Motif scaffolding. Sequence first.
Motif, short mmCIF file in Angstrom:
data_model
loop_
_atom_site.label_atom_id
_atom_site.label_comp_id
_atom_site.label_asym_id
_atom_site.label_seq_id
_atom_site.Cartn_x
_atom_site.Cartn_y
_atom_site.Cartn_z
N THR A 180 0.82 -1.20 0.00
CA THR A 180 0.00 0.00 0.00
C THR A 180 0.86 1.26 0.00
O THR A 180 0.56 2.22 -0.73
CB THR A 180 -0.95 -0.02 1.18
OG1 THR A 180 -1.47 -1.34 1.33
CG2 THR A 180 -2.10 0.93 0.92
N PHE A 181 1.92 1.28 0.80
CA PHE A 181 2.90 2.37 0.73
C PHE A 181 3.50 2.48 -0.66
O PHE A 181 3.58 3.57 -1.24
CB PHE A 181 3.99 2.16 1.80
CG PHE A 181 5.31 2.83 1.48
CD1 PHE A 181 5.46 4.20 1.60
CD2 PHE A 181 6.40 2.08 1.08
CE1 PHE A 181 6.66 4.82 1.30
CE2 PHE A 181 7.61 2.68 0.78
CZ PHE A 181 7.74 4.06 0.89
N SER A 182 3.92 1.34 -1.23
CA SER A 182 4.48 1.32 -2.58
C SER A 182 3.47 1.78 -3.63
O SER A 182 3.79 2.59 -4.51
CB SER A 182 4.97 -0.08 -2.90
OG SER A 182 6.37 -0.07 -3.05
N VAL A 183 2.24 1.26 -3.57
CA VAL A 183 1.24 1.63 -4.56
C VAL A 183 1.00 3.12 -4.54
O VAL A 183 0.93 3.77 -5.60
CB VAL A 183 -0.06 0.86 -4.32
CG1 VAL A 183 -1.15 1.61 -4.94
CG2 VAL A 183 -0.01 -0.41 -5.04
N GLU A 184 0.87 3.70 -3.34
CA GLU A 184 0.68 5.15 -3.25
C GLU A 184 1.83 5.88 -3.90
O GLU A 184 1.62 6.81 -4.69
CB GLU A 184 0.53 5.56 -1.79
CG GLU A 184 -0.72 5.05 -1.13
CD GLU A 184 -0.57 4.94 0.37
OE1 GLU A 184 0.58 5.13 0.87
OE2 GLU A 184 -1.60 4.69 1.04
N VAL A 185 3.05 5.47 -3.60
CA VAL A 185 4.20 6.13 -4.20
C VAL A 185 4.12 6.02 -5.71
O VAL A 185 4.14 7.03 -6.43
CB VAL A 185 5.50 5.53 -3.62
CG1 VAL A 185 6.70 5.84 -4.49
CG2 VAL A 185 5.70 6.06 -2.23
N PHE A 186 3.95 4.80 -6.21
CA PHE A 186 3.82 4.54 -7.64
C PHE A 186 2.76 5.44 -8.27
O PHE A 186 2.99 6.08 -9.30
CB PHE A 186 3.48 3.07 -7.83
CG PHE A 186 3.35 2.64 -9.26
CD1 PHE A 186 2.15 2.75 -9.93
CD2 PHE A 186 4.43 2.11 -9.92
CE1 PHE A 186 2.03 2.35 -11.24
CE2 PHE A 186 4.32 1.71 -11.23
CZ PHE A 186 3.11 1.83 -11.89
N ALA A 187 1.57 5.49 -7.65
CA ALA A 187 0.54 6.41 -8.11
C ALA A 187 1.06 7.84 -8.16
O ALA A 187 0.93 8.52 -9.18
CB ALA A 187 -0.69 6.30 -7.21
N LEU A 188 1.66 8.31 -7.06
CA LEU A 188 2.23 9.65 -7.05
C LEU A 188 3.28 9.80 -8.15
O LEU A 188 3.36 10.85 -8.81
CB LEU A 188 2.84 9.96 -5.68
CG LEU A 188 1.82 10.13 -4.55
CD1 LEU A 188 2.43 9.82 -3.17
CD2 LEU A 188 1.21 11.52 -4.59
N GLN B 183 3.49 8.12 -11.03
CA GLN B 183 2.85 8.21 -12.34
C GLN B 183 2.12 9.53 -12.50
O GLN B 183 2.08 10.08 -13.60
CB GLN B 183 1.91 7.04 -12.54
CG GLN B 183 2.68 5.77 -12.57
CD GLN B 183 2.01 4.75 -13.43
OE1 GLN B 183 0.86 4.40 -13.21
NE2 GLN B 183 2.73 4.27 -14.43
N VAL C 39 8.28 8.31 0.89
CA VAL C 39 9.27 7.28 1.14
C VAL C 39 10.07 7.60 2.39
O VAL C 39 10.21 6.77 3.30
CB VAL C 39 10.17 7.10 -0.09
CG1 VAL C 39 11.29 6.11 0.22
CG2 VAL C 39 9.33 6.62 -1.26
#
Lengths: 125, 125, 96, 96
Positions: free
Chosen positions: B81-89, B91, B102
């Motif tokens: 969930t931390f990673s997905v949020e970052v990835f979303a941010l 993109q 991070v």
Amino acid sequence: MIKSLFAVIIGGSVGCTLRWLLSTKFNSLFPNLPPGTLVVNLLAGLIIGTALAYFLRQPHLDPFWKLMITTGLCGGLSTFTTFSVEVFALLQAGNYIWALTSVLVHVIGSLIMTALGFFIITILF
Amino acid sequence: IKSLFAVIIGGSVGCTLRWLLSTKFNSLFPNLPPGTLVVNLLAGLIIGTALAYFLRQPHLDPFWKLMITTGLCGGLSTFTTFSVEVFALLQAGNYIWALTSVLVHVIGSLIMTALGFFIITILFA
Amino acid sequence: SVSSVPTKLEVVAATPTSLLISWDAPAVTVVHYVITYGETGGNSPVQEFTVPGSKSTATISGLKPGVDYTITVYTMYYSYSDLYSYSSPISINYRT
Amino acid sequence: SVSSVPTKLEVVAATPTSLLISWDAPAVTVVHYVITYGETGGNSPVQEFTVPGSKSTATISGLKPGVDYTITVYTMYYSYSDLYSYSSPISINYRT
Ligand SMILES: CCCCCCCCCCO[C@@H]1O[C@H](CO)[C@@H](O[C@H]2O[C@H](CO)[C@@H](O)[C@H](O)[C@H]2O)[C@H](O)[C@H]1O
Ligand SMILES: CCCCCCCCCCO[C@@H]1O[C@H](CO)[C@@H](O[C@H]2O[C@H](CO)[C@@H](O)[C@H](O)[C@H]2O)[C@H](O)[C@H]1O
Ligand SMILES: CCCCCCCCCCO[C@@H]1O[C@H](CO)[C@@H](O[C@H]2O[C@H](CO)[C@@H](O)[C@H](O)[C@H]2O)[C@H](O)[C@H]1O
Ligand SMILES: [Br-]
Ligand SMILES: [Br-]
Ligand SMILES: [F-]
Ligand code: NA
């Protein structure tokens, strides 16, 4: 909310259990960067990357499955704390080179495994 | 099999607690969802206190340790969930908040593990 | 619970063959915006293009003078519950 | 089932009142080592101190000449299944 709750627990239990089995079997083989806790983050990072792209293309999937796969499986499969203590223990052992290494690999590695699972399904579709 | 139950029972509690916290709160600040932060800060606290504390009680039932750590902390905390949020941010082009997220998650969870540790550590001294 | 649709979509400057539109970002991580446009008379190919999540304005070009266009904007946004998903559009009509 | 116990514990340098010991680290993440030493003869108090997990040697000082000592080493290590726990000791005898 009870049906939701069952998805969280089933997916989570499948996740937590998988992380446990993989960790006890593989972590002790490379303590500077325990590979069991890495693979379950690289694996669930991959899964959520595919879920990113697939859910998008399937607006009508039952949420029960989406919740069971993401909050459940991926939330229970991944760990922030085991990754955290290993780095903490590396720091207290003064093994800073591997504490830092451990942080980069987990973070940049998860994102990659996410982008991987995302851009695979994108391109498939 | 008794270990299995501890992971499940603990993980289920951790996952269930992660689900309720994130749905209620992530949407309040999407640049760094605070539900997902809090579960990671909180599990870090728990694992820090569990670190110092369990060291001093080497007779405790490993069942209780596994429930709290691999179970509860493993379920409560989340990497994807931390990673997905970052990835979303990432993109979305929101680099500054991808970076912040991070630092805050990693630096923050380490500081929380250290407090939980040193609080108990200083308590016994 | 939080709306992922832009608000206040509007033409802020126009020539006869182009529109500068803008909208208010919604309160979510918008990954990118989609802009659709076509002639309101049910007889033109709707065209869609994307603009990045950080922008809140876009230029629609190559239009015909004096024609009624329907213009919509929707988000591809990240949210906790749904991961990536598309939002409902906000739509306006505008005559060049 | 990876040993947290150090191996090959040995005296590498001695003076009449000091010892220089070295061991091989166990293949785990040792936080610190505990070193203990007392006179092999009976009810003398055993003394201890720590050495950081990076180090794998330790000087013992303030000993009596021509006395038999029991030197013991064990670890405070991080493992996945135990978090912070203690290895069993490895032990040698040595006479100043
Ligand atoms: C950027 C994110 C930061 C978040 C917070 C990080 C918290 C890190 C905790 C580190 O714990 C300390 O580490 C020292 C160093 O490893 C240890 O010193 C021990 O080891 C040293 C290094 O070998 C020796 O020099 C010392 O004297 C000896 O006490 C010390 O005991 C231990 O309590
Ligand atoms: C620390 C590294 C971690 C591992 C790697 C993680 C990768 C995450 C980002 C990848 O996704 C891409 O991000 C670009 C940047 O956000 C987007 O560009 C889009 O947005 C840009 C915004 O400036 C435009 O310039 C581009 O033309 C436009 O395609 C692009 O579409 C998107 O697929
Ligand atoms: C972002 C914050 C980063 C900084 C975090 C704190 C780092 C400095 C800690 C200062 O206090 C330390 O307390 C340790 C005990 O808690 C002592 O360790 C002594 O005792 C320990 C066991 O308690 C052993 O592991 C050590 O090797 C031994 O030096 C150590 O001497 C002493 O300096
Ligand atoms: Br843990
Ligand atoms: Br997730
Ligand atoms: F992950
Ligand atoms: Na987790």
